[PDB]
Amino acid sequence: DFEGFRKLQRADGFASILAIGTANPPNAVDQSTYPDFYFRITGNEHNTELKDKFKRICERSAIKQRYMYLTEEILKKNPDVCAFVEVPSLDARQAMLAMEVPRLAKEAAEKAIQEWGQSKSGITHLIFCSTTTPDLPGADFEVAKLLGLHPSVKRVGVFQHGCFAGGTVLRMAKDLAENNRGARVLVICSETTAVTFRGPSETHLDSLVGQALFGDGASALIVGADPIPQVEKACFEIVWTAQTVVPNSEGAIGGKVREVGLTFQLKGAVPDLISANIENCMVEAFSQFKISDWNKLFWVVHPGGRAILDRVEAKLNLDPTKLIPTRHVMSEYGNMSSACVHFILDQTRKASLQNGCSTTGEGLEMGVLFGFGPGLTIETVVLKSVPIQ
Amino acid sequence: DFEGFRKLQRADGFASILAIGTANPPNAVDQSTYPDFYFRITGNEHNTELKDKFKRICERSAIKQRYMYLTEEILKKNPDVCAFVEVPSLDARQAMLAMEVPRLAKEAAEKAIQEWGQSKSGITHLIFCSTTTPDLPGADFEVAKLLGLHPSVKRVGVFQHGCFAGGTVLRMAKDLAENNRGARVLVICSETTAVTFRGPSETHLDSLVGQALFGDGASALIVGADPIPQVEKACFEIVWTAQTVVPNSEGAIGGKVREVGLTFQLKGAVPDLISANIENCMVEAFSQFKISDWNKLFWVVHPGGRAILDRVEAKLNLDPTKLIPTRHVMSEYGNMSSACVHFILDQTRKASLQNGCSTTGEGLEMGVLFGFGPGLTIETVVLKSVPIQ
C-alpha cells in the first residue's frame, strides 16, 4: 500500500506544455530612437563620446524594439534611477518591482489560463521566476494572490538565477508534473529593467551593453502530464533536461543587488565561451535519441545577444531557418531574460500553424531549447513537438 | 519508445533522507548575556526601558543560546550594521553574506557527504536555500563551486521564501529524487543574521523580538530514491507533501530587502493563525493513511517561537513528548529559519538512537513536518520513519 501509494501518486506520460501566455508593459521603445532618449533622460547629452559607443551598440543589437515599464514620466520623477551609481536607488526600484512584476505575471497567466480552458482552481503548482523579488513573500505569493489561485497551490519562487532561468523553469516544471498525477503547473517568468536601468559610465562599457538589450516581459505556461483527451491540447512535451557550468567562465556574467540597485557585469568572452561548449551539450542531450544532425531539430535559443546567436549558428552551422523564431523575438522584444525562451516557444508554435507545418515544432518532431546565464550556466531542454491535425 | 524512456528515466521507491549534516558559526552566544551585550554593542545602554523590555523578551523566548556570525569584533568594525535604520547597511551585509552563507553551507554538507559515504560526483542535484542571496549567480552556484561539485549538477536556488523553506526544499527534493532514477539531491539551507541584525527601536517592537529569536546555522541533506543496500542508510522517507496559505493572514510574517538590509515585520497574531489551521492540514495529510490520532505520529515543527509551539500543542492536544526534539533544538540554536527543521530531523534520529527506539522516529512509523513563513504559508510534510535493526 505504501509502494502502492507511489505509482498512484505519480503521473504517466511526459510533462507537456498545454498553453502559453504572454504580456509586456505598454511602453514600446523604438531602438532607433533610444540612444537620444536614453542620454537625454539621464542628462548625459554633454558626453558625445559615450553616446556614439551606445548608438553603435543599439544599432548592432539586432533589436528594433523593447517594452519598458520605465517611461519618461517615471524617469523624470526618479532622478536617482537615472544616475549611474553616485546615489543609492534600491528602495525606489524595489517599489516599482513589487507592483510591476506581479502585474505583468498575472496578465500572462490570464491568457495562458484562458487558452488552457480549464478552471484556475485546477492549477496545483506555481513556479515563479524573476531576476529578483523585493520582499518576503516573494513574487510567487503575490501573483497567486492576484490570480485568485486556490490557497493550497504549491509555490516555488525562482529568483536571482539569471538569464538562463527560462530553462531551469522547464526543468522544474517537468519534475513537478510527472511526479504528481493530475497536476497542472503554472510556470511564470516576469522581468523588467526597473531594477537594472541606470545612467551610463565610460568606465563601465559592459553595463552600457545591458542598457541596449534588456527589455520587459512576462510569459506563462500551464504544464501537465497526461493531458485530458479532447480537452487539453499539448503543443510541446518536455523530454529531457540538463544544466551545466561552462569551464573557465567564472565571472563571465554576473550581477549584484546593492544600495544602487542591481549591477550588471558581462564579459566580452560570453559568445566564445558558449560556442566552444554548445556542441558538447548537444551530444549529451541527443545521442541518447540517436540524433547527430542538429538541423533535424527545431530551435529555441535564449536571445542573450546578437553575437551569441551568430556563434552558436556557426559552430553548429545550423541552416538559416533555425534561429528565425528566436531572432523574431529578440528583434521585437529584446532580451527579456528568463521570459525570452517561452516567447520563442509561442512564436514557434504560431509560425507552425500559420505555415501549414505538420507539427508545432515547424514540421520537425524533436527540438532543443537553451538557456544562458550567470555561471556561466548552460541550461538544456529537449522537446518533442506535437502533430497538428 | 517514449513509454519506455519515461519508465527508465524515473526512480522506483520513495524519496529518502540518506544523510544529515549540520554546521554553525564559532561564536556561541548565550541568551542570558545578550541583553547587556546587545544594548552595549549598539550604544543603547542608556535606554534602560527598552533594554529591560528586551531582557524580558529574551527570557520568554525559551532560547538558551544561538550561534552568530556577527561577533563583537565584527560589529565594532561595522557601526552601520548597529544602527536601526538611520544609515544604510545593505552593501556591508551583502559582503558578509557572499562569504559566510556559502562557507557555512559547505561545512554542513561536507559533514553530510561524509555520512552518506558516497562520491561527490554522484551528486546530480543541488537545492540551496537562504533567506536571501547577494548576487547572481546565487549561493547555489557558489556552494557547488566550494564543494567541487560536478559542473553538471542540476542546481536550484530557493531565495526569499522564508522560515517555511525548510520544508519546500524537501517538497522539491522529493519530486527531483523520485522522477530521476539514480538521482541524489544535496539539500542545503544556510542562514545568518548578518543581513538582519540591527539596533533596537521603541517604535518597532516586532523587530525587537527578531533580534532575540534568530540565530545562524546550516543544514545539509542527501536525498535520493532507491537507496543502495548496506551502502546507503536511509533514516526518513518523504511520502506526501503540501503547502498552504492560511486565510486572511497577510503581513503577519514578512521582510523587505532595502538599503538598510532585510527589515522584518512580525504581527503578534502569528501564533493564532498557525494554530487555528494546522489541525486542518493534518486531516488533509493523514486521513489518506487512515490516521486521526496526531499523537500516533512523531513531530518536526518549525521553531518559530515558543508561543507558536505552545499554541499548536494545546490546539492539537499533543503529548508533551512530541515537541521534545523541536523545543530542544530551538533551545540550543534558536530560529535558524529554514535550517531548523533539518536540525530537528537530525536531533530526532539521534535521540531515537541513544534511547533505543524501534525506529528513527523515536519508535513511531509515520511523522509530520511543518514549516511556517511569510504568506502566511504552511508547509506540511508527511515523513516515513525507518526501523533500527
DSSP string, A142-188: HHHHHHT--TT-EEEEEES--TTHHHHHHHHHHHHHHTSTT-EEEEE
Q: What does the alpha-carbon distance between residue A209 and residue B382 come to, in Å, rounded to a whole number?
A: 49
Q: 3-state DSSP call for residue A129?
A: strand
**Are residues A131 and B133, on separate chains, in Cβ contact within 8 Å?**
no
Are B379 and B285 in contact by the 8 Å Cβ rule? The answer is no
How many domains is chain B built from? Answer: 2
Q: Which phi and psi angles does A182 have, rounded to 5°?
A: 75, 20
Q: What does the alpha-carbon distance between residue B72 and residue B78 come to, in Å, rounded to a whole number?
A: 10
Point out the domain boundary residue: B214, B234, B254: B234
Q: What does the alpha-carbon distance between residue B285 and residue B316 come to, in Å, rounded to a whole number?
A: 15
One-letter amino acid at B278 equals I
Would you report the helix, strand and coil content of chain A in percent, each value rounded to 5? 45, 25, 35
Q: Which residue has the cell 522506483?
A: B12
Determine whether the annotation assigns residue A350 to a binding site.
no
Mutation site for A-interface testing, chosen from B160, B262, B266 by largest number of A Cβ within 10 Å? B160
User: What is the separation of C-alpha B267 from the centre of its chain, rounded to a whole number of angstroms?
Assistant: 20
**Are residues B10 and A9, on separate chains, in Cβ contact within 8 Å?**
no
User: CB-based contacts of B190: which residues, under 8 Å, 6+ apart?
Assistant: B23, B101, B102, B104, B105, B108, B128, B129, B130, B139, B143, B217, B218, B219, B339
Q: What does the alpha-carbon distance between residue A85 and residue A133 come to, in Å, rounded to a whole number?
A: 21
Looking at the structure, do residues B321 and B350 belong to the same domain, yes or no? yes
Out of B137, B154, B241, whose CB is closest to A171? B154
* CATH number of the domain residue B103 falls in: 3.40.47.10
Q: Is A282 exposed, middle or buried (0-12, 13-18, 19+ CB in 10 A)?
A: middle
* Residue A387 DSSP symbol: B
Q: Which residue has the cell 518532431?
A: A365
User: CB-based contacts of B73: which residues, under 8 Å, 6+ apart?
Assistant: none
Looking at the structure, do residues B166 and B19 belong to the same domain, yes or no? yes
**Are residues A136 and B255, on separate chains, in Cβ contact within 8 Å?**
yes
Looking at the structure, do residues B289 and B170 belong to the same domain, yes or no? no
Q: 3-state DSSP call for residue A373?
A: strand
Looking at the structure, do residues A65 and A107 belong to the same domain, yes or no? yes
Q: How many residues does chain B have?
A: 389
Q: Which phi and psi angles does B299 have, rounded to 5°?
A: -120, 140
User: CB-based contacts of A368: which residues, under 8 Å, 6+ apart?
Assistant: A282, A285, A286, A297, A299, A300, A380, A381, A382, A383
**Are residues B377 and A155, on separate chains, in Cβ contact within 8 Å?**
yes
* Buried b / exposed e along B330-360 (16+ C-beta atoms within 10 A): bbbbbbbbbbbbbbbbbbbbebbeeeebebb
Are A50 and A35 in contact by the 8 Å Cβ rule? The answer is no
Q: What does the alpha-carbon distance between residue A363 and residue A353 come to, in Å, rounded to a whole number?
A: 10
Are B227 and B182 in contact by the 8 Å Cβ rule? The answer is no
Out of A9, A168, A257, whose CB is closest to B94? A257
Are B247 and B272 in contact by the 8 Å Cβ rule? The answer is no
Asked if omega into B79 is within 30° of 0 (cis), the reply is no
By annotation, the residues of A acting in catalysis are 163
Looking at the structure, do residues B72 and B219 belong to the same domain, yes or no? yes
Closest listed residue to residue A235, CA positions, set A21, A54, A59, A24: A21
**Are residues A94 and B258, on separate chains, in Cβ contact within 8 Å?**
yes
Are A250 and A79 in contact by the 8 Å Cβ rule? The answer is no
Looking at the structure, do residues A296 and A160 belong to the same domain, yes or no? no
Give A168's contacts in chain B (Cβ within 8 Å). 156
Are A301 and A344 in contact by the 8 Å Cβ rule? The answer is yes
Chain A: give the shortest CA distance to residue B36, in Å: 31
Are B292 and B279 in contact by the 8 Å Cβ rule? The answer is no
Q: 3-state DSSP call for residue A105?
A: helix
Looking at the structure, do residues A239 and A155 belong to the same domain, yes or no? no
Looking at the structure, do residues A81 and A144 belong to the same domain, yes or no? yes
Out of A134, A158, A242, whose CB is closest to B256? A134
One-letter amino acid at A17 equals I
Asked if omega into B262 is within 30° of 0 (cis), the reply is no
User: What is the separation of C-alpha A169 from the centre of its chain, rounded to a whole number of angstroms?
Assistant: 9
**Greatest Cα-to-Cα distance within chain A, rounded to the nearest angstrom:** 75
Q: What does the alpha-carbon distance between residue B278 and residue B381 come to, in Å, rounded to a whole number?
A: 12
**Run of H or E residues at A300:** strand A298-301
Give A239's contacts in chain B (Cβ within 8 Å). 2, 5
Sheet holding B154-159, edge to edge: B154-159, B125-130, B184-191, B217-224, B15-23, B236-245, B377-385, B366-373, B298-301
Are B159 and B130 in contact by the 8 Å Cβ rule? The answer is yes
Looking at the structure, do residues A189 and A220 belong to the same domain, yes or no? yes
Q: Which phi and psi angles does B171 have, rounded to 5°?
A: -70, -40
Closest listed residue to residue A20, CA positions, set A101, A105, A113, A102: A113
- State how beta strands B298-301 and B366-373 pair: parallel
Domain that holds residue B174: 1-234
Out of B90, B171, B179, whose CB is closest to A154? B171
**Run of H or E residues at A135:** strand A135-136
- What is the interface size between A and B, counted as CB pairs within 8 Å? 181
Secondary structure of A204-264 as H, E, C letters:
HHHHHHHHHHECCEEEEEEEECCCCCCCCCCCEEEEEEEEEECCCCCCCEEEEEECCEEEE
Give A178's contacts in chain B (Cβ within 8 Å). 6, 10, 179
Q: Which residue has the cell 494545546?
A: B314
Q: What does the alpha-carbon distance between residue B78 and residue B96 come to, in Å, rounded to a whole number?
A: 11
Q: What does the alpha-carbon distance between residue A145 and residue A151 come to, in Å, rounded to a whole number?
A: 8
Are A50 and A207 in contact by the 8 Å Cβ rule? The answer is no
Are B264 and B207 in contact by the 8 Å Cβ rule? The answer is yes
Out of B6, B135, B242, whose CB is closest to A256? B135
Chain B: give the shortest CA distance to residue A277, in Å: 12
Taking the alpha carbons of A327, A331, A337, A340 in that order, is the dihedral positive or negative? negative
For residue B93, give Cα distances in angstroms to A1, B69, B81, B155, B261: 50, 11, 8, 25, 7
Q: What does the alpha-carbon distance between residue A152 and residue A116 come to, in Å, rounded to a whole number?
A: 20
* Residue A357 DSSP symbol: -
Give A88's contacts in chain B (Cβ within 8 Å). 88, 259
Secondary structure of chain B as H, E, C letters:
CHHHHHHHHCCCCCEEEEEEEEECCCCEEECCCHHHHHHHHCCCCCCHHHHHHHHHHHHHCCCCEEECCCCHHHHHCCHHHCCCCCCCCHHHHHHHHHHHHHHHHHHHHHHHHHHHCCCCCCCCEEEEEECCCCEECCHHHHHHHHHCCCCCCEEEEEECCCCCHHHHHHHHHHHHHHHCCCCEEEEEEEECHHHCCCCCCCCCHHHHHHHHHECCEEEEEEEECCCCCCCCCCCEEEEEEEEEECCCCCCCEEEEEECCEEEEEECCCHHHHHHHHHHHHHHHHHHHHCCCCHHHCEEEECCCCHHHHHHHHHHHCCCCCCCHHHHHHHHHHCECHHHHHHHHHHHHHHHHHHHCCCECECCECEEEEEEEECCCEEEEEEEEECECC
Looking at the structure, do residues A230 and A249 belong to the same domain, yes or no? no
Q: Is A9 exposed, middle or buried (0-12, 13-18, 19+ CB in 10 A)?
A: middle
Point out the domain boundary residue: A188, A204, A234: A234
Span between the terminal Cα atoms of chain B, in Å: 42
Chain A: give the shortest CA distance to residue B46, in Å: 31
Looking at the structure, do residues B312 and B211 belong to the same domain, yes or no? no
Looking at the structure, do residues B204 and B251 belong to the same domain, yes or no? no
Point out the domain boundary residue: B186, B214, B234: B234
CA dihedral A127, A131, A134, A140 (to 10 degrees): -10
Q: What does the alpha-carbon distance between residue A5 and residue A20 come to, in Å, rounded to a whole number?
A: 32
Asked if omega into A227 is within 30° of 0 (cis), the reply is no
Q: What does the alpha-carbon distance between residue A374 and residue B152 come to, in Å, rounded to a whole number?
A: 14
CA-based nearest residue in chain B for residue A280: B152
The answer to whether B163 is a known catalytic residue is yes
Grid coordinates given for A75: 524617469
For residue A320, give Cα distances in angstroms to A23, A129, A312: 28, 31, 12
Question: For residue A209, how many other CB atoms are within 10 A of its CB?
Answer: 18
Resolution to 1 decimal, in Å? Answer: 2.1
Closest listed residue to residue A304, CA positions, set A347, A368, A252: A252
Q: What does the alpha-carbon distance between residue B385 and residue B376 come to, in Å, rounded to a whole number?
A: 28
Mutation site for B-interface testing, chosen from A1, A90, A149, A160 by largest number of B Cβ within 10 Å? A160
**Are residues B154 and A2, on separate chains, in Cβ contact within 8 Å?**
no
Determine whether the annotation assigns residue A266 to a binding site.
yes
Of these residues, B58, B82, B129, B163, which one is catalytic?
B163
* Residue A45 DSSP symbol: T
Secondary structure of A58-97 as H, E, C letters:
HHCCCCCEEECCCCHHHHHCCHHHHCCCCCCCHHHHHHHH
